[PDB]
Amino acid sequence: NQEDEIKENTGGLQTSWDQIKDKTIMNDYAVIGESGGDYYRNPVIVALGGANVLIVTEKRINYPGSANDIGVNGSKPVSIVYLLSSDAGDNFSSPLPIGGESTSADNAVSAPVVYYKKDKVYVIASAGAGISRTDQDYSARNPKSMLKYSVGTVTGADNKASIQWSEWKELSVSGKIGENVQFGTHSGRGIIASDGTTMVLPIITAEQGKNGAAKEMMGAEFYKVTANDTLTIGEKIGQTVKFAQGSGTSGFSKYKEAKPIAYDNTKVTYFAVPNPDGGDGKMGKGDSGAENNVTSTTIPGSEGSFGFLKLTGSWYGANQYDPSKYASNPSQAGGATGDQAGKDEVLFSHVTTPAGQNQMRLLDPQQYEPLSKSLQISKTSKSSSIDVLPDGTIIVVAEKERNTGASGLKFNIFFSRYTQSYLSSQLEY
Ligand SMILES: [Mg+2]
Ligand SMILES: [Mg+2]
């Protein structure tokens, strides 16, 4: 179950093809290791600008999470923490809780959805009950479901960045989601539309029943949210998504959490994770045009938050490019002359069985269908997240090295950095 770690003093951002051409795995190490009774889970990674990297994670305080692996459960403290690097991930600060350490159910937050374009980081989190399944019917629970958000103001992203977070505030769903709908978030990097200001908010819905009469009928609603220091929920995008009963336990839907992979200002396209209880082991693809148009893909998948990065003309793969030029014009940096166009590409990583092996893949940027090759990035995992640095190298945060002696799902949090040529050599023909 243990990984072979690489810890290097890179130069920070790379600045020339000669420096980078022979490098493959530039870093691959646990930024968070043993943590006693605390569980660090569901990480998301952000390249802030320059050599600055942000990792956001939930922290379940002295307990493993709900029985269905949700951070909040309407009674235990759960924080959302952040780590910062100013040397392209060579070194990360010790994790700090956004807004101070959680102390009760009333300030607990988990499953962060993280949005960023350039000066402000927006984190929208599950709060109160989340989509946790407990002993009570949802209608009887007192902390019911809630959404909360914090805004991180970024300073110095072109030197060595600092962030300060606003107070957690409630993001009301009144008039958007009815009572009864138990709802929450599913961890990941959030989509910002082409205008740079409209965020896509995916609200996960779930009929969970209770212990002794469990259900898991899941769905989603997508909403516009305008980037702002005060957030409010805007217009609905398309239809309410509801997944159908699977072939397993009665009341368990074939797919669980839907996560946006694209938004064209008209419809949200989503990948949905297959239910290990009644699904087909493959990621599902659908969009907000209908209540349920999801179709099976050929991508193997399971529970958890997949990583997904779309590059627009900025993938050079095995071909030479100028990493200094990449910082100012990522789509025009290729060739020995340093000014050729790259191509579109999608990078995707997810586990193939529950808490199993994490495979990275290239997907076609129009239909998101996989190429034939896949690269194992972890023996044991569940959630991961991908981004690209201003020098063109690929960064990943992922749960790895499951502690099988621990009560729930306990992992270490890994940071990894790869050259595009290495990834190409493993994923392309
Ligand atoms: Mg070092
Ligand atoms: Mg304050």
One-letter identity of residue 176:
K
Q: How many whole angstroms from 164 Cα to the centroid of ligand 2?
A: 8
Q: How many whole angstroms from 91 Cα to the centroid of ligand 1?
A: 7
Answer whether 189's CB lies under 8 Å from 387's CB. yes
Q: Which residues are in the CB-under-5-Å shell of ion ligand 1?
A: 9
Task: Identify the nearest ligand to the CA of 167 by its number.
Answer: 2
Answer whether 387's CB lies under 8 Å from 395's CB. yes
Q: How many whole angstroms from 10 Cα to the centroid of ligand 1?
A: 8
Q: How many whole angstroms from 355 Cα to the centroid of ligand 1?
A: 30
Q: How many whole angstroms from 9 Cα to the centroid of ligand 1?
A: 5
Task: Identify the nearest ligand to the CA of 12 by its number.
Answer: 1
| Residue 324, C-beta contacts closer than 8 angstroms, at least 6 positions apart | 15, 16, 391
In three state form, how does the secondary structure of the chain look? Answer: CCCCCECCCCCCCCCCHHHHCCCCEEEEEEEECCCCCCEEEEEEEEEEECCEEEEEEEEECCCCCCCCCCCCCCCCCEEEEEEEECCCCCCCCCCEECCCCCCCHHHCEEEEEEEECCCEEEEEEEEECCCCCCCCCHHHCCCCEEEEEEEEEEECCCCCCEEEECCCEECCCCCCCCCCCEEECCCEECCECCCCCEEEEEEEEEEEEECCEEEEEEEEEEEEEECCCCCCCCCEEEEEEECCECCCCCCEECEEEEEEEEECCCCEEEEEEECCCCCCCEEEEEECCCCCCCEEEEEECCCCCCEEEEEEEEECCCCCECHHHHHHCCCEEECCCCCEECEEEEEEEEECCCCCCEEEEEECCCCCCECCCCEEEECCCCCEEEEECCCCCEEEEEEECCCCCCCCCCCEEEEEEECHHHHHHHHCC
Task: Identify the nearest ligand to the CA of 9 by its number.
Answer: 1
Angstrom distance (rounded) from CA 417 to CA 88:
9
Q: How many whole angstroms from 169 Cα to the centroid of ligand 2?
A: 12
Q: How many whole angstroms from 166 Cα to the centroid of ligand 2?
A: 6
Q: Domains in the chain, please, with CATH?
A: 17-427 (2.120.10.10)
One-letter identity of residue 314:
S
Q: How many whole angstroms from 121 Cα to the centroid of ligand 2?
A: 16
Return phi, psi of residue 46, to 5°: -140, 125
Task: Identify the nearest ligand to the CA of 7 by its number.
Answer: 1
**What kind of experiment solved this structure?**
X-ray
Q: How many residues in the chain?
A: 429
Q: Is 142 annotated as a binding residue?
A: no
Kindly provide the resolution of this structure in angstroms, with one decimal: 2.2
Angstrom distance (rounded) from CA 416 to CA 404:
23
Q: Is the dihedral of CA 112, 356, 206, 370 positive or negative?
A: positive
CA nearest to 184, candidates 116, 251, 257, 78:
257
Task: Identify the nearest ligand to the CA of 85 by its number.
Answer: 1
